[PDB]
Amino acid sequence: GGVVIA
Amino acid sequence: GGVVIA
Amino acid sequence: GGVVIA
Amino acid sequence: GGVVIA
């Protein structure tokens, strides 16, 4: 599970 | 370039 | 599990 | 370049 702002 | 959530 | 701002 | 949450 995760969140990426890139 | 990329993003992987796996 | 994680969060990345990059 | 990249981000991996795995």
Resolution stated for this PDB structure, in Å = 1.6
Q: Give the torsion sign (CA, D6, C2, A1, A3).
A: negative
**Whole-angstrom distance, CA of residue B3 vs CA of residue A5:** 9
Cα dihedral B4→A3→B1→D6 (10° resolution): -30
Q: How far is D3 from chain A (nearest CA, A)?
A: 8
Q: Tell me which chains share at least 3 CB pairs under 8 Å with chain A.
A: B, C, D
Q: How far is D5 from chain A (nearest CA, A)?
A: 6
- Return the percent helix, strand and coil in chain C, to nearest 5: 0, 65, 35
Any B CB within 8 A of A2 CB: yes
**Whole-angstrom distance, CA of residue C1 vs CA of residue D6:** 8
- DSSP per-residue string spanning B1-6: -EEEE-
Question: What determination technique applies here?
Answer: X-ray
